[PDB]
UniProtKB/Swiss-Prot annotation, chains A, B:
The record marks D30, D42 as: Involved in capsid protein dimerization upon acidification. It is found in: Virion. Self-associates to form the irregular polyhedron core composed of hexamers and pentamers, that encapsulates the genomic RNA-nucleocapsid complex. Assembles as a tube in vitro. Binds to inositol hexakisphosphate (IP6), which allows the assembly of the polyhedral capsid. This is Capsid protein p27, alternate cleaved 1. Homodimer. Homomultimer. Homohexamer.
Length: 77, 77
């Protein structure tokens, strides 16, 4: 699988293409299953494009899963 | 704390300076405590300079902790 910790959203990539890429790489990694979701969330925050990073930090505290953040972002495009 | 998933060894940084930087950022993150060590190991493998990446993958299967990998690398300089 790809090096998950190297995955960033590039300037010709959408957020969802980066999320899909990232998640596939995390799932193929040696991380424990319980580590996957928190890693994915941190990488969403840190490795998306700046405008998306800024949108993610507006999300309510009740949205905690990767899927909730994906929907939050996509539904605001 | 710093964005752990953005931390890479730069060309004027030693491995240990990167490990220390990385580990401080991981410890200050919201990751669950059990996720820290596997994240650190993956980032050692993925985010160090190529020569160090190549040295790390020679390590025996018995070396599993961050500290064991740090000693492995430093003791071979």
């Amino acid at each position: 699988a790809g090096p998950w910790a190297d995955i960033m959203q590039g300037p010709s990539e959408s957020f969802v293409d980066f999320a899909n890429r990232l998640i596939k790489a995390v799932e193929g990694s040696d991380l424990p299953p319980s580590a996957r979701a928190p890693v994915i969330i941190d990488c969403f925050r840190q490795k998306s494009q700046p405008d998306i990073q800024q949108l993610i930090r507006t999300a309510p505290s009740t949205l905690t899963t990767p899927g909730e953040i994906i929907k939050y972002v996509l539904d605001r495009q």
